[PDB]
Enzyme design. Sequence first.
Site, PDB file in Angstrom:
ATOM      1  N   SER A 286      -1.287  16.341 -11.345  1.00  0.00           N
ATOM      2  CA  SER A 286      -1.516  15.932 -12.839  1.00  0.00           C
ATOM      3  C   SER A 286      -1.758  17.316 -13.553  1.00  0.00           C
ATOM      4  O   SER A 286      -2.326  18.243 -12.953  1.00  0.00           O
ATOM      5  CB  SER A 286      -2.774  15.129 -12.830  1.00  0.00           C
ATOM      6  OG  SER A 286      -3.129  14.922 -14.172  1.00  0.00           O
TER       7      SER A 286
ATOM      8  N   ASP B 276       0.852  -1.295   0.000  1.00  0.00           N
ATOM      9  CA  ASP B 276       0.000   0.000   0.000  1.00  0.00           C
ATOM     10  C   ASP B 276       0.827   1.257   0.000  1.00  0.00           C
ATOM     11  O   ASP B 276       1.511   1.631   1.062  1.00  0.00           O
ATOM     12  CB  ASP B 276      -0.785  -0.117   1.343  1.00  0.00           C
ATOM     13  CG  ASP B 276      -1.669   1.103   1.621  1.00  0.00           C
ATOM     14  OD1 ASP B 276      -2.084   1.711   0.651  1.00  0.00           O
ATOM     15  OD2 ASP B 276      -1.931   1.398   2.810  1.00  0.00           O
TER      16      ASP B 276
END
EC number: 3.4.23.22
Lengths: 330, 8
Positions: free
Chosen positions: A199, A35
């Site tokens: 992004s 994770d």
Amino acid sequence: STGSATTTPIDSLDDAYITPVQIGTPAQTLNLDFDTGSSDLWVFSSETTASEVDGQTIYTPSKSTTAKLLSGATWSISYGDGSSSSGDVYTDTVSVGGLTVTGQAVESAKKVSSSFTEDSTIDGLLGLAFSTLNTVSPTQQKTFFDNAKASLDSPVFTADLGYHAPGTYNFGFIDTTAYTGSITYTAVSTKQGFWEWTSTGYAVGSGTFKSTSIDGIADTGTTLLYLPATVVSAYWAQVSGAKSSSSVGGYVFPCSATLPSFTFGVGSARIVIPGDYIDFGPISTGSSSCFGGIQSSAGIGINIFGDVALKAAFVVFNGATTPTLGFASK
Amino acid sequence: TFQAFLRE
């Protein structure tokens, strides 16, 4: 040194991926969920309350000649989905795909919440976010990657997750045959302890790319792609039978539809999520409605580039003193 | 059945 291990989805929907990890001497193999969204390595154990253990493999520290109890340290963690676990700590030798770390902290669960008891496939989690999120007290413990860095041929790890198929986690090297084109690197902010990046924009299907900053975290331990409500609404507006369902918890659409692709920008490059990856699966078996792979992050508070987005690319977690995140199409 | 690994 290097390590290479196969990671496999725990079910037919790619809910999560498990990778075998060898703990202790002689080795006890446990399937852990790798994770990048937390920093605790914890497993089910011989100390876990009996009625909360159900089908998982446990780690028994008294059968490992290399285990040492870390005096007085305890841990307690809770996740986004509400699950939680707590316990004590031992240090032991842990190896992943051939790469061994001595003295790694292996947090031993005394109790685990219902959702962990319920899923027979996950024996624990192995955290790969920054060590500042580690839950052990009074002194935090380093993740398997941080303890590994000194011996790694290069301080990186890559994630190559497959769509309905196994994939690989590599430590210490970049496999140039697993991707196409070149990797584009983007800066990571570690302020919050995540592999957080921005992004440069998105596109839905064959439409225009809009330049708009989307700050999010790359999390291999989140199943879905969670983006801002107005970007998630612009994507579903292109699928004729999709609607937001309050009962199911998100946007749903007829299983019958061909969904458009979703592109996300990384610097000047673009990573395209094919539409079939966005179709998570039927709401129930035999249903004609399917649950969408891209959902709003408004209720969570942060955008999360989960497995739906990460399995469409080869991703490099560059752990150098100034870390960066690399993405390539594959 | 989704998962979302740290955070309050």
